[PDB]
Design a binder for this molecule. Sequence first.
Ligand SMILES: [Ca+2]
Length: 682
Amino acid sequence: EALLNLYRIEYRPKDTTFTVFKPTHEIQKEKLNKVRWRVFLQTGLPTFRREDEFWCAGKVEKDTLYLTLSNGEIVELKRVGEEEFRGFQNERECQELFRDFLTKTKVKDKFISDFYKKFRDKITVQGKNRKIALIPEVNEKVLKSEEGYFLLHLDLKFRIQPFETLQTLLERNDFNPKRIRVKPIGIDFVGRVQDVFKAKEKGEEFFRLCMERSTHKSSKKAWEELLKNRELREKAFLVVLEKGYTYPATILKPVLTYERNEVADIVRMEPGKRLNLIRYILRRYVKALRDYGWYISPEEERAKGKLNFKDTVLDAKGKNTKVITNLRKFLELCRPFVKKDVLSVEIISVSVWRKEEFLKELINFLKNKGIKLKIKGKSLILAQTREEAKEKLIPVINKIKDVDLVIVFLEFLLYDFVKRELLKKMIPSQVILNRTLKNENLKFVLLNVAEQVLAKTGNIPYKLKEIEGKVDAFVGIDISRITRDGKTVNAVAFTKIFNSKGELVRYYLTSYPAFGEKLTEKAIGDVFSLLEKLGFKKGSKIVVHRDGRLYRDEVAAFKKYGELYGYSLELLEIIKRNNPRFFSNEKFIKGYFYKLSEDSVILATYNQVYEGTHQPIKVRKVYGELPVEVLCSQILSLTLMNYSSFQPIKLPATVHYSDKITKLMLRGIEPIKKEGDIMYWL
Ligand SMILES: [Ca+2]
């Protein structure tokens, strides 16, 4: 009844003797995780952090003081002796200690090397003028169940990386370095390139210093070479990454995303393939760690069940029908909620009397639905090939005209390019592919298109009848910032305020200047003053969905602005990346769940359509009066507010597209301050 990457993990050590280390100085949050790493390096025995005390697994002979040196340059001293271990207090401690065992027993290294021996041939992809490898990454995190047992969350993903180094690459040809996600060899880290400069620019002691300040071994050895090898040092580059971390171009390998696409889509794997592989990885950990006192359950943790949600939607006349794939029937007969009876549309065709026949049928379908499209201007473009990305650049730049919608007929980076540009100008866009009319049944395309054009223009086809829970507004936020050295430069906030019936009340997109705490606070106070501007009286229930992880600062701002305006707040974090997957043959997984400790739930938000393409989200109730199951049902109901009946959308309307829109506005030159009531991104 639905399996997951979760296995009951347990630790019952033989030699229960542990050496404690406490600093003679203070506590430094960001640095605590770095010290713990270094305590494990100098000692050689697995370590965990119990508040201030650094507990180490075993006996270190003659141990007095530990003089670990951090990245900063700050030296840290710590001493003390023994105490006997009686289980863990956190999942964090379990993970910290478990991980160091995988390292010291080199079992993840034996695996990586044994997976290359049989699979090197399969792992490699070749093209004309370039060669790529699909490097395996095994990420383990220790979670805690509802009941209280620790779960080893174990997955296997494939990191797409070129054979060539970032140095070999920067040497040959000068391609745009910034925003390129890179990763150091023996390091579990990925960051985006900020600054590139020559190693000639720095003298002898820099390399020796940055070597003495290097956290891992491959980096000690990379700085050792630039210092000791002058052939290298001259032609070498040093790369500064996002958070600050400086690494030599010599140990940096680029990380790729996006025929290569075809041969690299075998990486999606069948659910049986990851599951049996994860099952193969587990077995090796148990050989390597049973003697050390570790147990890992061979059996996956099964999901609890299906969470029903209110999927019933209705039109302007009030026709009710449950949404399982949204009837074509319902969308044929439905009367929309008209926001603009008459519309101004621009059209574009990328060609080499079907498009025309279709456009006419569209116009008619919608006319008989109350909305009339009035064509402002047909822009016909003539392709041969790619020369068009240029011949399309020209008409797109001028398309701000006053258009309500833009319909484009194309003959995949094509769809992607066009939508992004019309997203920047904030003009709703419907990109009809010529391949779609050729391949699908014209009525379904007409319907697929109908439902979507209606949503984009505020003339929504339907809205939910009931959402479980008496909540007065659903606000979804993502705040994306631009990092330059240390303190925040540019920032964009995108808020989406919704109804108890799921309809869009207002959105708010603003770019914010450079100030410390006044950023987070203004961004969230602005959100609050907007709710006030929208007539939300004192004591109204407000559910907030955060696209990312709610930073401590944000959680704060909310609670205080919740106190200030007298609102009943519910704060949810919506984590889409690196969650425990669901393995089963059910194919109708929407609503499936596994429940964790601090009211966190691994949830299936959409049904399995394409193979291996199933990413469950992790919903966390950071702050809240309502149960997670209730909040989860509302998330599930709001997925339907994305008006994509023929296609699936993983995210609730409150956060769907929120992270893509903010990161886009950041790449701007001008700041925004816009408010609307149109779902222009769809
Ligand atoms: Ca973000």
